[PDB]
Design a protein around this nucleic acid. Sequence first.
RNA 1: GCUCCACACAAAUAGAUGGAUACGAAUAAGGCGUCCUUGUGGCGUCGCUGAACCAUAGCAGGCUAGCAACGGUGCACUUGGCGGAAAGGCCUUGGGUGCUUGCUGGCGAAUUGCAAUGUCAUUUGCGUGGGGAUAAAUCAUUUGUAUACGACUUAGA
RNA 2: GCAGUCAAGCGUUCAUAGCGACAUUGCUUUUUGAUUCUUCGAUCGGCUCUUCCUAUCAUACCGAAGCAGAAUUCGGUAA
RNA 3: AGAACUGGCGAUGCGGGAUGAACCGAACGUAGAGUUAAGGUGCCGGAAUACACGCUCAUCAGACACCACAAAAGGUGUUAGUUCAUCUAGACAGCCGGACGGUGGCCAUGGAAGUCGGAAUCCGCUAAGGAGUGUGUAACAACUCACCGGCCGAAUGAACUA
RNA 4: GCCAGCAUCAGUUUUGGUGGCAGGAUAAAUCCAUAGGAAUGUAGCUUGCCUCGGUAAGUAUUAUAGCCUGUG
Lengths: 233, 187, 171, 197, 56, 134
Amino acid sequence: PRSKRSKLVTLAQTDKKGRENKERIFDEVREALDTYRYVWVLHLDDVRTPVLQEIRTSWAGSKLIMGKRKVLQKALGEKREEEYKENLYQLSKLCSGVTGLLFTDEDVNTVKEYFKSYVRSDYSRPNTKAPLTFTIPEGIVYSRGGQIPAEEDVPMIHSLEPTMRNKFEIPTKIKAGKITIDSPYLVCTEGEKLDVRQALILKQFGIAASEFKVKVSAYYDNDSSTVESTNIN
Amino acid sequence: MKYIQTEQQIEVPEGVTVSIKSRIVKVVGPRGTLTKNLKHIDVTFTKVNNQLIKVAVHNGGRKHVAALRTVKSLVDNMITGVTKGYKYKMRYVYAHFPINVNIVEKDGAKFIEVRNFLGDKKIRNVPVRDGVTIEFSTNVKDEIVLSGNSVEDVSQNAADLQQICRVRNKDIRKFLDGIYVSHKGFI
Amino acid sequence: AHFKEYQVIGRRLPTESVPEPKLFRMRIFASNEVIAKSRYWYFLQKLHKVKKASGEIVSINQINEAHPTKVKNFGVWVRYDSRSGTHNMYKEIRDVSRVAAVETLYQDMAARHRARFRSIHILKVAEIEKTADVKRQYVKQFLTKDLKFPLPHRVQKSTKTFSYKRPSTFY
Amino acid sequence: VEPVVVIDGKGHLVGRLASVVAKQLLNGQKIVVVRAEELNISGEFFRNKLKYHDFLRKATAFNKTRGPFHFRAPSRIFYKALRGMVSHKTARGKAALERLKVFEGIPPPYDKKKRVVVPQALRVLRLKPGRKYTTLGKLSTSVGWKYEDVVAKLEAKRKVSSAEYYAKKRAFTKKVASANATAAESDVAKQLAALGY
Amino acid sequence: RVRKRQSRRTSTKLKEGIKKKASAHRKKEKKMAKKKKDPGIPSNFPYKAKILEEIE
Amino acid sequence: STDSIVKASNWRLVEVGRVVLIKKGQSAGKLAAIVEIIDQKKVLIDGPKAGVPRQAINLGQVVLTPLTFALPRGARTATVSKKWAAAAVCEKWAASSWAKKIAQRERRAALTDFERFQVMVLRKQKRYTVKKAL
RNA sequence: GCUCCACACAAAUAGAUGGAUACGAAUAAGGCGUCCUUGUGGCGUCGCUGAACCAUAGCAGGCUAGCAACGGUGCACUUGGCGGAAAGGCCUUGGGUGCUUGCUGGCGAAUUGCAAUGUCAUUUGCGUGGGGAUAAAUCAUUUGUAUACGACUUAGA
RNA sequence: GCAGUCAAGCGUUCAUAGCGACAUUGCUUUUUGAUUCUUCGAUCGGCUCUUCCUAUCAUACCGAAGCAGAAUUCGGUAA
RNA sequence: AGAACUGGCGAUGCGGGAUGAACCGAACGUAGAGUUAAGGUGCCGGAAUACACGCUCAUCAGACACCACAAAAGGUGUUAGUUCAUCUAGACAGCCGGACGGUGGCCAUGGAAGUCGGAAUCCGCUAAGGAGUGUGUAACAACUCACCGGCCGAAUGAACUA
RNA sequence: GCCAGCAUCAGUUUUGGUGGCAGGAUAAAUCCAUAGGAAUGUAGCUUGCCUCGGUAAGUAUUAUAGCCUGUG
């Protein structure tokens, strides 16, 4: 019973959900299929909850169901035999990653134009090159780190120097409470496939200079019971 | 429970050549060669096809299985060191007394010489190990880089450096002078 | 010793009022008929109100395995009134006969638990017909396709005291 | 089955070798042990060094000159292990121990002679693999034996001479075996084959 | 410098006294003495669904 | 010559079809084929040719040979005999060094004193010619 | 009084009665042979105990006649080299000297009586005449670098 | 120590008997470092000299401490 | 500690327990052969370095135990079991991302925004997201877990017993 | 008179070889025949990885391997 790793227990309020949540999502999607006319698939791989809430508040009449890929695959039907309605696994197979499956009764073209005109700012999200280039100045670094006049900003907090020095691999010293470096550290170049620590550096300095525009792949109509594929971003 | 047979796989890239009689292991690649004795271990080796070498243990327990996994890890480290290499960057810091770090060749032995640590006249000498190369990093204040293929020798020399300059009978909350490992990685 | 399986039947003695009573049967693992009959009465006293003087044994018989060369995977229920109220155990043994399974079971219990013949109770030994009903991993180890394994340390029994060879343990 | 038996101590266990040797001397066989410095004990070095220290702190208090005499050499360690088996306080035990000779290394005349082993005392056969063991030269040099550096220097010469001897003998044997193979297929050899030779 | 070691020799007085100690404690426990739930059909038994059928 | 040269360290493996020599028991020097594996220490063997009964046996009682032949798992005695004959393992065993050594030693044991004298005379005759050749 | 040999008798005894028959290293690895790129190589082969190998016929081993081969082995000389851990042994050259069961022959054995272990493997001691060469210590005396007495330390033809 | 509280477990084939680890309350006299300190019936101590134990006072090496240094406190190996 | 039987020593040698008045066996004439008891079979030491299955590594293991003492437990040493749970609508471990909104919730204070403290501890939108598990800031920030999702692709976790 | 060897016997004892019998499920088995069944899936076949013919998943119940159960 021994020579194991002890699980670090902590005492919080929230608790795991289990199979009841998944069955609830299953029943919800299956009862909304009968209700609404059109159903769409939206690939939302890395999002902010306020952006998702904006997308949801854009229509209180239409539904948006997130959840687990394999659960929505089962609700729709992955096999041509196992399916709720006809030609539905043809849609269910399109789901790739984080899929937000939307239901509506609204016209095709309103949705199509909305989800290509909708664009927001977001972080650069590693494994994705960034359209920016940053040499930090070679003096004292500020909370924005080379984005505005330093006379606006204040120096960052001394508590971040272990983080910058170890996790971000920046060469860092501090003279009094201020953080300092000797030479201008370049972090990234445009058209350079980003890595985790570059992304974290840009996040720490507060750089949302990437275009979040949701991708839509397919679309299915209940009365026609047909699929239709439109890669629109 | 006396597992009837347990196995681990070792991947060999194209430039690397691995030679294994009884439990001696020779690994040759671009950056050089490496040798290691594993006769203490009592496992079995075998080859599949020029890129995959398997190590096996028959009728053994928990400690034997652990020895299998760490053998795999050691051979993988050898391959990584002969292909890419190991590079450890250390930085030496001071508040008042500038620590002077130099190299000396004494009887052809390559000692590292540290002077004036916290204001002492003692001269701290650290022998450099074979397969380790010291250079003083340019355009970076008070940094020294140890490069080689033996991660063991490189890390142990860095440890010797950061241990020889330990502070004695002083609050380390106040006295920050020392030599510390800044970065580990490849070449 | 090397056990045997014995069928035993008991009659508890007739009376007026009750001719031909109900003939309870049991299967026993034991070295010989004496021990088998003692165990029979030992279990029958627990189950029902009988006594060696109040009852009699009808037919002691032996049971030989139907296929004592076919290899089999036995599952055994065991229990032993220790230390708490009685608690059960399920074990799996790969062997040819119920006798061998019971023998190696008694030895394994004596080794791994210091639990003794007096302490042990055999509930049910049962062959498992289908694979994938085998639950324990040490028996699952030996059912794999085209199983092979070596014996890497050979040490040779030597009849003499001295040897002129610097011996070798190979295979 | 011999007048005298030379035993190479390499790869052996001290107590088991002591037992078989003692019971042989008490039966009347003359035995000569060599390479005691390569002898082995079960258990890690630390344990047996601790044991020898436990033995070494024992001494008559009012006069140390008359107490247990702690001999440091491997030959003497083996002799102690053996003498503790034999009833050495009898004439029979004395005569038995006088049939024994223990040597560090292989000196003359035994270097030019055959050596044997005892398979029920060998480490590789008796011990399970994955078990720490101890060697007697290391132990004795730890507890104060000041001669391990000469015995190695001398064995390194003995081995070279023996290798020359073996290289000569091996070519002679090749010649002999080839001549025998050529003599084979003769009717004399066929008769010998029939009769088992 | 290793220290002493306790001895394992038993010195007869001790084993007599222990026998007497136990012979007294047994009487004391016998004197204080003056003041089931069957565990079921355990799992991992593959053919457990058949014992539920000999009842009726 | 820049390929890996890892050793093999061949071994006689415990497998169905592996034929074995029984070194202690009632058989005492007979052959049999492993037909099934009971555990790390026990196997099921069957030799109908030399006449050993099908049984469970510990591995200490037998010694594996380098020979093997095709045999399904859990075969019966008749199938064992058929595969035995088709593979012709007895002839390979007879040709092997090992069996020749056994046969030689039992011949030497069965030798009579007169045959011993003959062998000595023949050895002298051979020695003369061999020492002449040298 | 001591000393080499041309040996009458005594001696073999914690226990002869064919031979103590020489690689190292590893053991989840090795030995032998062979080939070549000389390697942590390729190929073949062996183990699974010395139950081996070598010797081994003759009166406790005789006296003789041959056949074939120039091999084997013993004895004493002789050449040269090696070996210092306790070497004290190992190998080698040559010529003598015998024997040879490698093969074929001829004589003798007997009565130790139906078994009795049935005895077989240095010298000091006196014949031996080899037969010539010519040291020390202790006591006593003395010294005092020493000392209870012994001892120690020195000196003395 | 006495008397209690609680409850992790044990628990006549007891749910509402009993036992009960770890914690914890009261009594001991007081709240403002004024306590004048204040003893109340036992049927050994001192020389020479040797050794041993460690349960380490100092010396040696380390760890943790609001340990600035200096000094000190607690602790580990160590006779 | 008192009484009531019983057995033995005292008076009694022999074998064993290394040794022993009261433990095991067994009671005695002088001898021989055989078989055993109790206890034992690596050497001392007569007799298996026997056979078989497991477990165990102890920086002074153990080599008759006795919930007889130290005693009630502790331990990331090991083995075998019992119960309850999670899992191809993907479990455990790792990386990555989300981790929101009313709201900087109310008292308090020089300041305290989830995290010096006291007391509420609600609803909303959710796949899920505590009026907040910890680090941190003078306060914010940032990081983190609790909880959810993506990649990975099959077993895993907890409590107990021996 | 003293010490011994051998043969045939007697008493006590120990240790080998071999033969005839009776039982048990009138052993069980193995073995022979026959009816079914299945997988740690044989042949064959289908689709593919695809290093020259080795391969993964699907099929198929003895086929160019066999096994299990029952009955006799």
